[PDB]
Amino acid sequence: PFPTFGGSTGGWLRAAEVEEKYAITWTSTKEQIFEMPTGGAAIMRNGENLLYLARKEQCLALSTQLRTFKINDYKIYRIFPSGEVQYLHPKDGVFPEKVNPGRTSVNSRGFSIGKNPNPASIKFSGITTYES
C-alpha cells in the first residue's frame, strides 16, 4: 500500500532501523500527486496508503498537506526496532485542536505568567521557577 514513488536520498537512515521509525496511513479517494516532505512528488493510490518517515514532524507536515486534499483519516504511529508500535496521532481519535471530554489538563499553572517565584528564593533546591 505504498504510494507510487521512485525513491530519493532524503528518506530514513540507520536511526529508523536502530532507534525509532514513523508511519503514516491514510485513505485517498483518487490517485493524486502530493509533495513528499523528504523532497519530490509521489502519487497517492486509490484506497489505503502507508508511508514511512524518519521523524514525527515529517508525518505531521504530510498530514497538514493531506488536509488540503480533504483527507482527515490519516493515522500516525511510531515503530520501534523490536517491532512494537505506538499509536501517536490523533491520540484519542479526535484532533487535539477540538476539545474532547475525558482529556485531563497537563502542565497548567493556576496563575498568570507574572507570578512565578524569584530565582534567588529557590537556590540549591534543584528546581526551576517555572516548576515551583
Partner 1 sequence: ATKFPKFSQALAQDPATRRIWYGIATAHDLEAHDGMTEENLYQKIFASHFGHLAIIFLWTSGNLFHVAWQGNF
Partner 2 sequence: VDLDYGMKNSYVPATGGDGGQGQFGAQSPNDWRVAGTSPVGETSYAGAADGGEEPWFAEAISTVSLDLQKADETLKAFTKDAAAFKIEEFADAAMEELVGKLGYSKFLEMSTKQLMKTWGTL
Partner 3 sequence: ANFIKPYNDDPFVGHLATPITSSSLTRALLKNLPAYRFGLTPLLRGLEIGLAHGYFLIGPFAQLGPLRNSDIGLLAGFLSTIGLILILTLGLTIYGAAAFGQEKSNGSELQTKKSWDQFKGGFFVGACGSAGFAFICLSSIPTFAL
Query: Cell 521523524 identifies what position?
Result: 55
Closest separation in Å from C-beta 58 to partner 1? 19
Q: How far apart, in whole angstroms, are the C-alpha atoms of residue 72 and residue 66?
A: 7
Q: Between 39 and 68, how does the x/- string for binding to partner 2 read (CB under 8 A)?
A: ---------x-x-x----------------
| 86 interacts with partner 2 by CB under 8 A | yes
Kindly tell me which residue out of 68, 97, 102, 114 binds partner 2, with binding defined by CB under 8 A.
102
Q: Which member of 10, 40, 81, 117 binds partner 2 (CB under 8 A)?
A: 81
Q: Which of 84, 105, 111, 121 binds partner 2 (CB under 8 A)?
A: 84
Residue 15 or 41: the one with the smaller Cβ distance to partner 2 is 15
- Decide: 115 and 105 in contact? Cβ < 8 Å: no
Distance CA 15, CA 78 (A): 13
Strands 75-79 and 47-53: unpaired
Check if the beta carbon of residue 22 is closer than 8 Å to that of residue 77.
Answer: yes
Residues that bind partner 1 (CB under 8 A): 123-124, 126
